[PDB]
Amino acid sequence: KFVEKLEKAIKGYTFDDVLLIPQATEVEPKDVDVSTRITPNVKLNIPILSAAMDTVTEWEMAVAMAREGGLGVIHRNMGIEEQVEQVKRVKRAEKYKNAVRDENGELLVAAAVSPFDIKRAIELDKAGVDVIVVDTAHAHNLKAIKSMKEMRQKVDADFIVGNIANPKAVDDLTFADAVKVGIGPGSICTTRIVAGVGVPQITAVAMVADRAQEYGLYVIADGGIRYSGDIVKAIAAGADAVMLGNLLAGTKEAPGKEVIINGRKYKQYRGMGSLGAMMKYMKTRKFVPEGVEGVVPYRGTVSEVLYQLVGGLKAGMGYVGARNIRELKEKGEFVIITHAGIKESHPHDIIITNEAPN
Amino acid sequence: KFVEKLEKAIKGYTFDDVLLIPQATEVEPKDVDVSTRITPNVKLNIPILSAAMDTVTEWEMAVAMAREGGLGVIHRNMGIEEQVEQVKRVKRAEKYKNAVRDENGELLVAAAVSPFDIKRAIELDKAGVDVIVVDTAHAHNLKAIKSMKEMRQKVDADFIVGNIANPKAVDDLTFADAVKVGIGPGSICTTRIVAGVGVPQITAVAMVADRAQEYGLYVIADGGIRYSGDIVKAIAAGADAVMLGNLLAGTKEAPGKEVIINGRKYKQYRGMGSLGAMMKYMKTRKFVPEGVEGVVPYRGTVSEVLYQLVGGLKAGMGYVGARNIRELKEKGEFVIITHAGIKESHPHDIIITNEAPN
Amino acid sequence: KFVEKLEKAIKGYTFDDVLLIPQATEVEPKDVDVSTRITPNVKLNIPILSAAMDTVTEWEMAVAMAREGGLGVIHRNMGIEEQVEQVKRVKRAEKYKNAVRDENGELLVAAAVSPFDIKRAIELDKAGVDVIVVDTAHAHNLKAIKSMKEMRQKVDADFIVGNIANPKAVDDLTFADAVKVGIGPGSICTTRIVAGVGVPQITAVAMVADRAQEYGLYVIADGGIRYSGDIVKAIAAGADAVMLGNLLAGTKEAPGKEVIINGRKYKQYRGMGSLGAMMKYMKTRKFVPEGVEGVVPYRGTVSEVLYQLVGGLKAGMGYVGARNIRELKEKGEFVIITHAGIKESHPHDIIITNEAPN
Amino acid sequence: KFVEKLEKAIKGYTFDDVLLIPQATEVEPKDVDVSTRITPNVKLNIPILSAAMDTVTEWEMAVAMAREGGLGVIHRNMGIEEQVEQVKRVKRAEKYKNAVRDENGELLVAAAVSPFDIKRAIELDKAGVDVIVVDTAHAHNLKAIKSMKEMRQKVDADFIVGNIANPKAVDDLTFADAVKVGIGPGSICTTRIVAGVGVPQITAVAMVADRAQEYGLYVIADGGIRYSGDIVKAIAAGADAVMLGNLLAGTKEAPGKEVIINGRKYKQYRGMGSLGAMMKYMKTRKFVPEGVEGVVPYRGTVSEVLYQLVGGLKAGMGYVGARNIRELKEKGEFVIITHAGIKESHPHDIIITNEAPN
Ligand SMILES: O=c1[nH]c(=O)c2[nH+]cn([C@@H]3O[C@H](COP(=O)(O)O)[C@@H](O)[C@H]3O)c2[nH]1
Ligand SMILES: O=c1[nH]c(=O)c2[nH+]cn([C@@H]3O[C@H](COP(=O)(O)O)[C@@H](O)[C@H]3O)c2[nH]1
Ligand SMILES: O=c1[nH]c(=O)c2[nH+]cn([C@@H]3O[C@H](COP(=O)(O)O)[C@@H](O)[C@H]3O)c2[nH]1
Ligand SMILES: O=c1[nH]c(=O)c2[nH+]cn([C@@H]3O[C@H](COP(=O)(O)O)[C@@H](O)[C@H]3O)c2[nH]1
């Protein structure tokens, strides 16, 4: 019985365990289309959402994301009235040819809510939020799901529930428009260390994506993205879009506090499940933290970060012969590599003097 | 023949090689029950025992452990009369709703003895010890086992023999109430380096647990636990409880000497098979040490450490839908991960400023 | 579908994942012949080409390479007239018994061109270049290949197209004399990090070599070579020759700028896809860099570096009983090793005071 | 063809990839017998030989080794007359109950020779050397083997040829008494880096041992031993004895020059295939070095080192229920472990203050 648990254990892979195999390419890469659909009513011009964290997304980030064709999810570590005001400021913010707007030409915006905060949801919905993101650590909670269903029935906005890491969870969330995948891969996440629970992101996305495709739900890969190359892999693994925390934290638009150390600029970045975040409107029913607090170097503007990420994604799509997202998901093939392969993949046997992305 | 040894070699896994897969959860996590049975007459309120080491468990630790629902095993690197006095002080120590007590309302306590120290055992038994723990490096020793049987017949207390790492050893220990698993995983253990013998803990627990279940014996996972997440994995692998050395060392109650270095507080922690421990009542028939001496940072009180560990265990059980220990052992499923997966599981690509567990 | 991508994923190996198994040897090693054919009209006396990079190969490097029996590929990050002049200076440069010369006794030389630069190619061809090397990041580009075919028809020089990492690409390049293998292994390469695309070099060379052999095309392993041992492995994996960047950079003949740091000598080495290289005649249609800038320690003269590399290759060939290149490719057998095996393969448990290669 | 080389590649294991599984033990460990036979006329009281290196074995080391029941192999980086004198001094050196002596009560001694130095061999034989050790990097050399056969016919001493790493080599060396296994694992060895050739030691010993057993030849595992635990594994893998360089270097008896750095004592240790060793009577037909030069910390006397090593071996044998060497080779079973398992096997999550072996 216990030995069979080990013998039958599935083998899980993360971003660094795989590489995409180059293929014949007819069109690339400057002509690559990266638009993608995440909900019945929402198609982004770039497959990127900014995390719903208090050191990542507030109104400024959301405006910047929407102007670039992406989407910002206003965090919920604030009062309901404060969150509705953030949403309104974004919707009325409008040179940005890639911007994603609603029927009235207003920038799109999303906002996070707890599975039980139906009041908050309705207020956000009335404020004109385009997407409601049920933001929980383990969405496959029955009681929570019952509350989610009631919530879905009382709002018009599109509905995204996350996070999950087991395909079986999709079967009980078919009332949502999309599911967010990611349990334990976050840069500031300690859930796997504290709880011992999780699934390597590439494997998690693939398992969930196959099940989601069966029900008509979209998939968002959340957490663990460190390089543009990870985005290409996530999409090839089945995701329609990715959600970034670390890579967007430290940008001018990020609400994280500035920090200088040794003359170098940084910005705070912390898990919403950290003491600091808890010491700020959520009160989780958790006895111990599952996130840490840290800092990331100053990255410049959101615009500059997205240009690099999207640039890399387009290069990767060109290399595999994918003219659009659907084709990447369709024909992207993987090769599994070893630790030594990981080392050779990064720059090696050299004293780097400049790694600039321009 | 020799090549077949390699071809037929079993693949062994340790804590970091696996993760638990999230599942549908109906009740969690603050309502999770972590009580567990380790012997016919002993059920703990938390699945944790403090190691029988001279830098970990003496009367103060044992009192603190029992008051929290756990169990302390008084070490045997002292005289018989000194050990009986430690036991008595614990039994008469009694605001602690989770405390584990015997029929007379006295805190429970355990004590270690050598497989050959029948005299010590009888004295401990008369002093009212609740559990006698035969404490040896390799319990699957025939001569030792013969002595153990005679010992079991002369004491009333429950009987725990360890340590072992091969299921075949259980077959010859069916006269005991439970077996302790762990050969080589300890934080200060060098047995695998000095002797070249051992079995990765997750695999060892699983193999032994399947065999133990066939005979009605309980299983305790001893050594190698560094995080609360490891506890969840050990139990899911077949263990009824775990034994901690490193994580309890450095607490206020631990008998280890205090040490200050660079203004920072530490406490000594060393293997019982180290020169220091040997230079203190045991005299092993070993030519060379199989343990080292070191220090661990000050952790605070036992109460604070247990709260965190149990907190993590409850979070993990909630994530897999386990309302109690039996269900964790019953339905916990694993996913095997690579080194890259291990890296992504811990916090990464961030300059940590705070990892506090509150 | 997505899960099958992972289940059917091929396992890729790089240089450090393998070792060659020693065999009975009748002749070795000072009598080992390392000559090798890379094109219908070109056989080198040593299986080594210098990279077409602006910090590696200009006329001096090319002269040194040809004098030792190797081949230099003049980089294309300069004007057409400048490149033709570099070529002419090499052809007229002529104590060097291993030198490779053309029919008129002139040192051989190669030059790189973009798949679309037919003008540059014709000029190089008229200048007497022996080999034209189509130098692109992803040669399996249809539009590029159409241009390549027109180019092949307008020049007399031998034709080498690269780089590729998929055997399927060979099928569409049968009009060339040889293909260059290598996508992502370079010491200063970030293509796998930025685009997420690539194939571990040993696996890439083997897959391509089997397909190339079917069409009569030669194979050159480009990138990732750090030690002479890697050369032996690359050839045993199917390559006819290797191309070096890092190992030749830092030599007296390399055009890289000199840099002193802490009294120690270095020379600049950077990817052609780096800002620095771009800031120098190419203008790629890439949005972001896929190479970095760094420095390598001063290595001495090209002659000294080649002696060591070739020395190692000959030792390795002797150990496997290969009197020539054809036999190495023919009978070289591999054993796959683990990370621990990699550690034991390098010097260990010692404080090195001298690693000199004389 | 090339892809099949990878698909059919055998998987090789080194010491750190495996652990021995504990078993029922009837007698251990102070009653463990570690005597072992390495040749028809030579049985050692401990399975250890000192390397034939100029920084490891000269007459003092050989005397110390024989007095402890082991064997010293006088290195050949000296003149013939100097080597014969070293041998004589050992034979006439004679409180040492474990000493290994010949028929006349003289300490045993071995000496190394090149496969072609028949003159040196005969002189050593006449001087009374007990074992002649043909000392070469790749013994599976036909020309060398022909010379070896002539040598075997002109000496009375027992004959040991090494090193090899392929079982096929044993088939051509059946005229010898034993073969020495080890190509590339040495602490100061770079053969695998320079030549790309080698076989992980555990796998090499096992493959060779199975073939050797078929012909009646003994096996000596040479190189890569860092801990007593490695000795237990090597023997369990099929070896009759092991040869140590690094672990014996740095002892009082070792001829290596003393070196002080930061108040700490060290002794030089270098490969015989290093410039330093070459700059000292061998003149190899190698173009480049395959060994490095370094230093090891002062270890104390040979006696103290052997006590620890043998102590560990006995502990390991007790843990697996082996009362003697034959039984270890007979019933020792392995479990393969991962990198994480390797980490847990060593001391972890502790600040070591003392690792003393007493
Ligand atoms: O287990 C967790 N404990 C936390 O405290 C925490 N905070 C954020 N997150 C999630 O991490 C995602 C961002 O991941 P990255 O920084 O790698 O982009 C985000 O999308 C969040 O989903 C957490 N997960
Ligand atoms: O091989 C060993 N040599 C030793 O000297 C030694 N000292 C303690 N122990 C065992 O390690 C366990 C505690 O392990 P942790 O520190 O990882 O919690 C404890 O439960 C002890 O079983 C030893 N094992
Ligand atoms: O992806 C890349 N981005 C770059 O900027 C770049 N620059 C050079 N190269 C290629 O790397 C090869 C040299 O590799 P080594 O330094 O390891 O010898 C060379 O042969 C080049 O093919 C690049 N690849
Ligand atoms: O490839 C090699 N190049 C060298 O220069 C060299 N020097 C010593 N040896 C061999 O290494 C063995 C000692 O290995 P350890 O230091 O790990 O005990 C010894 O037994 C020697 O066989 C060499 N191998």
Per DSSP, the residues of B317-350 read: HHHTT-SBHHHHHHH--EEEE-HHHHHHHS--SS
Give the residue among D205, D208, D220 at the shortest CA–CA distance from D158.
D220
The helix-helix angle for A80-91 and A59-67 (nearest 10°) equals 30
Q: How far is C307 from chain D (nearest CA, A)?
A: 8
For chain C, where are the alpha helices, taking DSSP H only?
Answer: 2-7, 59-67, 80-91, 118-126, 142-153, 191-194, 201-215, 228-236, 275-278, 302-319, 325-331, 339-345
What is the torsion angle, in degrees rounded to the nearest 10, for the CA atoms of residue B254, residue B259, residue B264 and residue B269? -50
CA distance B161 to B159: 7
Take residue D157 and report the two structure tokens written for it.
């001493």
Residue pair B185/B202 in contact (Cβ under 8 Å)? The answer is: no
CB contact at 8 A, D86 and D112:
no
Please give the Cα distance from B46 to C335 (Å, whole number).
49
C87 touches chain D (CB under 8 A): no
Q: Please state the length of chain D.
A: 358
For A141, what's the count of Cα atoms within 13 Å in the CB-facing half-sphere?
24
**CA C39 – CA B113 distance, rounded (Å):** 78
Quote the DSSP letter at residue A108. Answer: P
CB B6 within 8 A of CB D206: yes
Interfacial D residues in 220-239 facing B (CB < 8 Å): 227-233, 236-238
Give the C-alpha separation, D236 to B283, whole Å: 29
What does the alpha-carbon distance between residue B178 and residue B218 come to, in Å, rounded to a whole number?
A: 4
- B contacts of D14 (beta carbons < 8 Å): none
Amino acid letter for position A17: D
The DSSP letter of residue B223 is S
Of A190, A195, A287, the CB nearest to B232: A195
| List of residues 6+ apart from C184 with CB closer than 8 A | A19, A344, A345, C165, C191, C192, C197, C198, C199, C223
Give the Cα separation of A261 and A259 in Å (integer): 7
Contacts of C38-41 with CB under 8 Å at 24 or more apart are C38/C71, C38/C131, C38/C160, C38/C177, C38/C178, C38/C218, C38/C220, C38/C240, C38/C241, C39/C131, C39/C158, C39/C159, C39/C160, C39/C177, C39/C178, C39/C218, C40/C158, C40/C177, C41/C130, C41/C158
Phi and psi at C145, nearest 5°, equal: -65, -35
DSSP 3-state assignment of C304?
Answer: helix
- Quick one: which of A72, A350, D130, D197 has its CA closest to C332? D197
Q: How far apart are alpha carbons C89 and B229 in whole angstroms?
A: 67
Contact B13, D19 (CB under 8 A): no
The SS3 call for residue B201 is: helix
Instruction: Show the beta-strand stretches assigned E in chain B.
Output: 10-12, 18-20, 36-39, 42-44, 48-50, 71-74, 110-113, 131-135, 158-164, 178-181, 218-222, 241-244, 258-261, 264-270, 293-297, 334-337, 351-354
Contact C336 D9 (CB under 8 A): yes
| Distance from C-alpha of A193 to C-alpha of C139, rounded to nearest angstrom | 44
Placement of tokens 């631990």 in the chain: B254
Residues A110, A49: Cα–Cα separation, whole Å: 9
Question: Nearest-CA neighbor of D355 among C301, B112, A85, B188?
Answer: B188
Identify the CA nearest to C336 among candidates D17, D169, D304: D17
- H/E stretch holding B230 reads helix B228-236
Single-letter amino acid, residue A205: V
Tell me which residue of D201, D197, D194, D200 sits closest to D290, measured CA to CA.
D194
Which residue in chain D is spatially nearest to B195 when comparing CA positions? D316
d(CA D2, CA C207): 7
Distances (CA, A) of D173 to C95, D112, D212: 44, 17, 10
Q: Residue B318 contacts by C-beta under 8 Å, 6 or more apart in sequence?
A: A138, B25, B27, B28, B29, B32
Q: Select from A21, A228, A233 the Cβ nearest to the Cβ of C194.
A: A228
Mutation probe of ligand 3 site: the residue of C15, C48, C49, C53 with most atoms within 8 A of C-beta: C53
Six-digit token string for A62: 């959301």
Q: Which residues constitute the domain of residue C147?
A: 1-358
Instruction: Give me the DSSP letters along B77-107.
Output: SS-HHHHHHHHHHHHT----TT--B-TTSPB
Please give the angle made by the CA atoms of C213, C219 and C224, to the nearest 5 degrees.
140
Method used to obtain the model: X-ray
- Using DSSP bridges, classify how beta strands B178-181 and B264-270 pair: parallel, antiparallel or unpaired: unpaired
Inter-CA distances, B72 with A64, D144, D341, Å: 57, 67, 28
What is chain C's Cα-based Rg? Answer: 20
Q: Measuring CA to CA, which residue among B326, B322, B306, B305 is closest to residue B314?
A: B322
Query: Residue B143 to residues B116, B147, B149, C56, D28: CA-CA distances in angstroms?
Result: 9, 7, 10, 72, 10
**Closest Cα partner for B108 from B135, B90, B85?**
B90
Q: Is the peptide bond before C115 cis (omega within 30 degrees of 0)?
A: no
CATH of the domain at B352: 3.20.20.70
And the tokens for D258? 């003393």
- Please provide residue C293's backbone torsions phi and psi, each rounded to the nearest 5 degrees: -120, 135
Select from A255, D113, A323, D53 the least CA-distant residue to C350.
D53
Q: Residue written as tokens 């305790």?
A: B220
Region for B105 from its dihedrals, namely left if φ exceeds 0, alpha if ψ lies in -120 to 50, beta otherwise: left
- Distance of alpha carbon B222 from alpha carbon B213, whole angstroms: 18
Q: Looking at CA atoms only, how far is residue A49 from chain C in angstroms?
A: 19
Residues of chain D contacting residue B13, judged by C-beta atoms under 8 Å apart: 338, 341
The binding site of B for NAD(+) consists of 135, 182-184
How close is the nearest chain C Cα to the Cα of D139, in Å? Answer: 9
Backbone angles phi, psi at D307, to 5 degrees: -60, -45
Q: How far apart are CA A28 and CA C286, in angstroms?
A: 10
CA C296/CA D174 separation, integer angstroms: 49
CB contact under 8 A, B338 and A294: no
Residue B9 vs residues B15, D107, D213: alpha-carbon distances, Å: 20, 41, 21
Give the single-character DSSP code of C271. -
Question: Hey, are the CB atoms on C350 and D9 less than 8 Å from each other?
Answer: no
CB burial of B195-218 (b: ≥16 within 10 Å; e: otherwise) equals: bbbbbbbbbbbbbbbbbbbeeebb
C-alpha distances out from residue B299 to B247, B248, B249, B302, B308, Å: 8, 8, 8, 8, 11
Nearest to C227 by CA among C5, C77, C1, C16: C16
Strand D110-113 with D71-74, pairing:
parallel
DSSP label at residue C108: P
Judge contact between C23 and D166, C-beta under 8 A.
yes
HSE (CB half, 13 Å, CA atoms) of A154? 14
Torsion A52-A54-A60-A61 (CA) sign: negative
How far is the C-alpha of B116 from the C-alpha of B145, rounded, in Å?
9
- Give the chains touching B; criterion: ≥3 Cβ pairs < 8 Å: A, D
D189: left (phi over 0), alpha (psi -120 to 50) or beta: beta
Report how many helices (DSSP H) and strands (DSSP E) chain B contains, helices first: 12, 17
Q: Are C12 and C199 in contact (CB under 8 A)?
A: yes
Burial class (CB in 10 A: 0-12, 13-18, 19+), D95: exposed
Q: What is the edge-to-edge ordering of all strands in the sheet holding D334-337?
A: B10-12, D334-337, D18-20
Strands C334-337 and D10-12: parallel
Contacts of C290 in chain A (CB under 8 A): 315
Contact B20, B330 (CB under 8 A): no
**B 290-319: CB under 8 A from A:** 307-308, 310-312, 314-316, 318-319
3-state secondary structure of C329: helix
Residue B170 tokens, joined: 């259980």
Q: Which residue is listed with tokens 């080495």?
A: C269
- Residue B112: name the closest of B75, B137, B164 by CA: B75
- Compute the half-sphere exposure of residue D305: CA atoms within 13 Å on the CB side of its CA: 26
In chain D, the number of structural domains is 1
Burial label, B268 (beta-carbon count in 10 A; 0-12, 13-18, 19+): buried
Judged by its nearest atom, the ligand closest to the C-alpha of residue B247 is: 2
Nearest Cα to D163, choosing from D126, D196, D201, D137? D137
Q: Resolution for this model in angstroms, one decimal place?
A: 2.1
Return the SS3 of B68: coil
Max intra-chain CA distance, chain C: 63
Does the distance separating the beta carbons of D165 and C210 come in below 8 Å?
no
Whether B228 sits inside 8 A of A192 (CB atoms) is: no
DSSP state of A27: S
SS3 string of chain D? CHHHHHHCCEEECCHHHEEECCCCECCCCCCCECCEEEECCEEECCCEEECCCCCCCCHHHHHHHHHCCCEEEECCCCCHHHHHHHHHHHHCCCCCCCCCECCCCCECCEEEECCCCHHHHHHHHHCCCCEEEEECCCCCEHHHHHHHHHHHHCCCCEEEEEEECCHHHHHHCCCCCEEEECCCCCCCECHHHHCCECCCHHHHHHHHHHHHHHHCCEEEEECCCCCHHHHHHHHHCCCCEEEECCCCCCECCCCCCEEEECCEEEEEEECCCCHHHHCCCCCCCCCCCCECEEEEECCECHHHHHHHHHHHHHHHHHHCCCCEHHHHHHHCCEEEECHHHHHHHCCCCCEEEECCCC
CA-closest candidate to residue C139, choices C106, C103, C177, C165:
C165
Provide the angle, in degrees to the nearest 10, between the axes of the packed helices D80-91 and D118-126: 30
Closest residue by Cα to residue D5 from C238, A209, A1: C238
Residue D270 C-alpha from the chain's centroid: 15
Cβ pairs A/C, distance under 8 A: 226
- 3-state SS class at C185: coil
Q: Which residues pair with D63 in a beta bridge?
A: none
CB-CB neighbors (< 8 A) of B353 in chain A: 268, 293-295
Is A137 strand, coil or helix?
coil
The two structure tokens encoding residue A96: 């940005």
CA-CA distance, B104 to C19, in Å (whole number)? 68
The alpha carbon of residue D134 and the mean position of all alpha carbons in its chain are separated, in whole angstroms, by 13
Query: Is D62 in the active site?
Result: no
Q: Does B345 touch chain A (CB under 8 A)?
A: yes
CB atoms within 10 A of CB B333: 17
The whole-angstrom separation of Cα D290 and Cα A126 is 75
Instruction: Name the residue among B268, B180, B285, B267 with its Cα closest to residue B224.
Output: B180
Kindly report the nearest CA distance between residue B282 and chain D, in angstroms.
16
| Residue A46 to residues A25, B16, C114, Cα–Cα distance (Å) | 21, 36, 31
